[model samples]
Target chain A: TVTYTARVANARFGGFSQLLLLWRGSIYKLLWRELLCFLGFYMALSAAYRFVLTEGQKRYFEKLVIYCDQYASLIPVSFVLGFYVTLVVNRWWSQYLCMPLPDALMCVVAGTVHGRDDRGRLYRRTLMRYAGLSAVLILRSVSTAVFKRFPTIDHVVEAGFMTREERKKFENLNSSYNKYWVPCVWFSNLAAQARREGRIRDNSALKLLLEELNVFRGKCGMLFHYDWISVPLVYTQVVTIALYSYFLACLIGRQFLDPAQGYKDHDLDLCVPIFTLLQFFFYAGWLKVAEQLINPFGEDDDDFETNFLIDRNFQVSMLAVDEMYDDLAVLEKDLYWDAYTFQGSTF
Target chain B: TVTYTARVANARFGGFSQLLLLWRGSIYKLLWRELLCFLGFYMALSAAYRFVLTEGQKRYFEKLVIYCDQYASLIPVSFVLGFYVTLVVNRWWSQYLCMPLPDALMCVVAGTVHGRDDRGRLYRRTLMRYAGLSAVLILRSVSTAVFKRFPTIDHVVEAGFMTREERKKFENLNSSYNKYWVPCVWFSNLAAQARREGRIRDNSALKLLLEELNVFRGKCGMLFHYDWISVPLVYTQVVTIALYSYFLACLIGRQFLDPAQGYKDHDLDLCVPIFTLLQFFFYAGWLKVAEQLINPFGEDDDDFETNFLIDRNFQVSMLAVDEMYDDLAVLEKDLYWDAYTFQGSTF
Candidate 1:
């Protein structure tokens, strides 16, 4: 009887998957930073445009029209900028952060189970995972720092002041725009760590995380809180900005700055509170949720069970690598040589 | 002499290469549809808001402040609605229509090449594919029709006309937006077909598209014709609104409603044409590009080549499944059976 078992030591998952995973993580991190930068710049630019550029010019231009046009234009642009940022960031999360951890964990298990004792390939794979994870972490940290420069005091204040009823309504709105950054960052880092260490080759932290995440998935109905806020905001901003800008542009002719018509205070007045309010609400919700579910891997009420995943992964890997000579040999010989006939002639 | 030749039937050229091709096709299709829906809805909504809504309320809100305030208030709500619709439609596309065709193709190819004569499986997969495609198509059609009913012809026509170059200084704004719509529609249909045919299995297409998109990445780079128009509008609007709104909200304790004291015709007037032109340009551009590039498998100049992809996929799959039994047997018999000893010990 011949035993056929996948050689764990000899197993080779391609380098491309590893590279792709790393690249995806980096891109996501970059996108998050870009969003923050854009937001900061837009806010600064808006402040300058209103106070400095068009402040005293109300004597030469109709204040109402100028204000209206500016207000209309700014809101749409802000929305677009915000929306695009969210879209890229969300996609990054889905691809690099969300999907890759599970896949990498699966690969490690496969390698550990089938690899020969002397191969040490599992250990190598673990190292690679760690390297990738570190790179992503560095990038994410840098991006976060850059975005943090943009003061969100106004947003925070608005969120704090809203009534519970208003908060709920606003929360619904904000939830759709909130980008999931922290969780993805943490998970990707963990996955990378597991990959670098040979522990994931058989009994590893990754398997545990995966199992925990699965539990988390079930508990939260597989809903990534970030998606609830970010996805909708991304889509809505695109629509709102485009429509509003077009509508405003149509009301005015080529010479948008005519001295006869004063600036419109109403236009700008409405947008400030709305934009600030939305931003604030999103931040508040995100902070609360993040704090509440900070340690997803803990086996507490809201925490994920890591032990189960580790055990399952270990079992699966063992099964994959275990030699079953009699069954394999018998089946192959019977099926390929004895049972089948070629051109009606039995061998 | 027992000589065995493993004849590998050519199925696809790459192992997961086909996945990329199919994913690209799917993304293109989805993006195309999204662009179109976004554009169509945006234009319709903007036009309605400008002509229908504004016209109706002109008597009650004679002052521009009241009108502008009212208009701005509706933006967040409208945007939320648009996003919701997009999400629902996207989900429908993925769940109902995106599975069967590609699955059947994969089964057939696998069966034929792997010598798995499971005709039943192929039939079942094919049936599922067709059913899913039909369901999605029907749903999309119905949804689009329902959304279209919201806009009146006058509103659309008026909004469309407002963005004309003659009225606005922006030469290519409306034209650019209009161009994208054509491509978007084209891509949507093509993608639907590819998904039905089972060409895509994994997210290969998405990777390719992302790479391509990244290659062409830049903040100011035009994704579609309308992007050129929309990007600027967005920037301008954000800056203007942020400035104006901040100034007004800070100055006035209550909302600005008096046209005589608060109206700035110059700024407000510019909003009309600028908004109209930008909205038209973006929606159109998104639609055109999305439609044109949706079906990457098609022979269209812009489409990703299906034949090349299939060839690559076949190669990879075969390579992955290759069995080096002869080499292994020789190694086992010669190396292991010949009394291999530890490196430090004599055999």
Candidate 2:
């Protein structure tokens, strides 16, 4: 949500270096704590071998290091990690696209639903309000922010999305399922009634309203399904186990042995384990990408702004259907309406 | 297109083992020739080392093998192959989703367009025809099967998508871009004219038709963009180079050296290198996944059935708007219409 598009509009030399320095939503900020813990644990193992171990104990530790390093190759974390993270990233983007905006439906309502009187205004406002209410109901189940905003049906009623009578009717339905779609059915029946009253004017207008309502309801259903069935729990567990076990092996296998004893590939004791730390950053950072995106409706810095969206959809939809109803600009023709030119020129 | 769904519908034991034996669209069918070539090259190298080398030359060959083995680890094909193949698979699925189907548009036309006479029939059929034409024009560009079927606009005209007069008007449009959208503009203008002539009854009905037209046109545009803008060429090249060089290194480095020379981990000379060949199958087969899916609109066995889709959309849209216009069955109250209980029960 924190866009850096302005800085990245045109690519330049060392362009991404500036983007990397930001704290919020940056890779380093997410990984720094884990990186510190890994380094600290590595240093502890390194110190015990160097300062406290007997010579015989040192030799045995060297054998353990060699044994650990050889078996580490069997993990193959990179292949599974890459595939899993890509799946998460795709799902995250799709969830963002599925956020119900109500822009198109509101436009159709303003154009097709007739009335300038208080009753007419009530028809338009109430129709849009049902759409906003349905979105609120679904988002309350899927987003922590929206759930906090509307904790119960009473809270929703207090927020003015439902009248007391409508709430009573909703409760009387007596179905053991999420009622996000209850408002949508209400919308279709209401539109048909509006058609009967001659406010919607024709069945085509009613059909348009019902079609757009079904589309809105479909997206809400999709969002709920996304939350209900995650990126299969077994796949997530497999990936998590792969990453943790590989690094656990790294914790033992990557320790610097005694340089005087002359182990192959363990020539110097720099005390810093630079390459192992880099591998830790690369592989662990990849797993973090999946973790942050697997459920992108969370309170993370880069998570979808579901609360802001709820407010925007409600306010804008109400504005479109009520205040902007039948509003128009003066009809005029100018410029290219009678153009005679075949080539581009300033007229 | 060759569905194995029934065989693997349940999580029975050894479920995918049967699936792997499939011929068309299977991994082995796609990868067998490459596998054979790799094996042939690997064998030639092995033969040279075993029979053609002098003792000194054999030592030199062993050194080259060690050098190739060490450098091969730097390529990291598994990481790049996994990521690239995932990207290709996502794009392929999205391209399938973007294929334009005129089902909804035809349904709206059937319900909204008035008069059961010849003129009303023309309005409905012509509107659906324009939609079908736009899809054919776009699919002609994106899909090889569609292109082969309708190799020219003349073929489209002969196939009844256009009359000679409309083709003449289509050719008169002076633009350098693909004229797939020409039919879409014709659709809007014709719908507006139908509104003026009283065939489409009301502005709301005209609005419904145009809205569906825009949705149809949007999918056509999306399909064109997918075909025009590809997965970055540089990324594909990087993945391909990594896979080939890693396998090239495997060819030289995975050779079995004589046990008499006493090189570490190169104890025996087995004529057939089992693990090396398995690695060849895996990494190369992984690369083949990307290759087969990179342009999924091509003539691959698993590619989208674009020509089939064109025929279906044309036939279905014609049938819906012409033969099925305003068609309805007798409406009567159902058993559930007066249900007295809240629980499930037989009527």
Candidate 3:
């Protein structure tokens, strides 16, 4: 959804000119509203001091500006923002890492769960179906996009994640907790049954299949763990409070006083405050980086395309264990097998 | 090796009184030497301004001090330090998590690879030995303490991680990269051999053992990866240059000038410079936090205690698959089992 590959490939003298053009997931897009509000208030205050306030009132306002400037440094704004953003970014990246992909488990299943008849195809598909079901259940709870797709048990049944009979049995289990693991239990039992029927061939292969299921299940549990004990409200609040207050202080503390007054560090008065806006841009933009990344399953441009991931996982896992099972590209000798052609670097 | 549990459980009315007192793995301990050297230079510069320099030179020095105080803001010290430390701390925690405990694999081995005879015990013990040896080989390269303990193949052999015959075979094998993965290959072969003897019961069960071994090896590979690709050198350099230079500028910029001369922020001649010292405590201490945690396998107090982990893994893997195999607590009815008034808590 958002690409910075060109900007990141090398540093340019003018600093990522191409990056400034992109709108999606850009800092300018995220911070524009807040920036406008801040600048509008800043201008209003500036106008009030210059044209509306009396001489004595202007002097009082100047003192207020100086007082705010002094007290602003007391907030420890940078330290709080720095630590909180770091915590958020770390969590966001880890959430991506723990995303349940059937690639690893699917490879093991295709290789070990042997046979090619309809019964074998039935076993492989059902096993993968069960694995996919577990992932969907967990994703439904954590991700709004997935929750909307599979809003209820009937939708899950219609979508082929559960059979009507299986759904009946599943509901009868009577557990208050998330039943994402129920499909995994069914998978274990089914795989064991296949082994007894001599389709799995050996205990080690069946055990390998079960181990992969558990690994897949574990990843699902981890995703839910992040979703449940996963979201952090209070820590995010502290950062927001500190950051919001800092910018609020900036609205007053960074105003330019009249040059004729000769306040300390107020020797010059530019109609527009350049440094305040630049400083505001970086801090506010830094907070923007964290806000978008904190919940990785969102539909935000920068969030993991969780919708695309689920589609790929479902399609690929089925293809892997069924049609792709024991299927291969035709084996052939290449030109290198016959002869090594004389070749050299031209440059 | 270190505990901060009770202190972390609550906040204080006072301050970080419980924190400052800690010595082992503390930032104060890690950074004191560097702090002393920096302070020593700062004082000599101050002493020269006071006792040795001419009035003309002192005037020049004061201008330079003010100049430094002004331009010190040019360095984005907080931005660089904050980002670098977060990256380093993230790596430290990941390295700890990738530490292979052998508990999970051992449990699977004990349950599946069944036998009660001496041969069965030998097979389980040998398999666990192969697992432990692979870890030690990898850890020795990454950790100073582990390397000291297993300085040579002879030492590894002496600790029973390798037999003399196995050492001969290991040294005979040729490879350019790290030889950490050799034992893992041996583990697969040995388990495959056990399956032929019907000890692993079936191919599915044998496959489970191999899969578990691979997972264990994958974690060991991750540890090596972290060590090889330590936090990017450029980032480390940038943070170090910024942080140290900030303190260097502080030496002059933060000094109390002659009160009679009346310099800005130097009005009070507090020779102690209490606030400057306080700044030193946290900035230096913050750097130290990253320093100690950057390589968590070190012999420092908070380092993962690599030696202890190795010892525990060896002992536990051996115990779990051998002595603890088929060992169960005697089954008996509990007090609640026989009681009639064991209704759920109704209050």
The numbered model that scores best in lDDT is 2
Deviation from native of the Cα of residue B33 in model 3, angstroms:
6.8
Tens digits of lDDT, candidate 3, B1-347? 58888777776764567687888777767878887787788788888889999998888889988998888889898788888888888988899999877887898889888889998998899999999999999999899999999999899999999999999999999878899999899999989889999889977788788889989999999999999998888988888888878988999888767777778777877667678777887877877888888999888888888998999999999989999999999998888885399100110
In terms of lDDT, the poorest run of 10 residues in model 3 chain B is B338-347
Please, what are the lDDT tens digits per residue for candidate 2 over residues A164-270? 99999999997887888888888888888888998998776787888899889989888888888789888899988998899889888999887788789989888
Q: Report lDDT (CA) for all predictions.
A: 0.30, 0.88, 0.85
On a 0 to 1 DockQ scale, where is model 3?
0.10
Error of 3 at B316 (Å): 3.5
Superposed Cα deviation of residue B72, candidate 3 (Å): 9.0
Candidate 3 chain A lowest-lDDT run of ten: A226-235
- Give the CAPRI class of candidate 1: incorrect
Please, what are the lDDT tens digits per residue for candidate 1 over residues B122-199? Answer: 322332232222322222222233114213323322433222332233233456332212222332334344444543
Interface DockQ per candidate? 0.02, 0.07, 0.10
- Angstrom error of the Cα, residue B336, model 3: value is 11
How many collisions per candidate? Answer: 107, 0, 14
Interface RMSD of each: 26.1, 13.2, 13.4
Which one is best on DockQ? 3
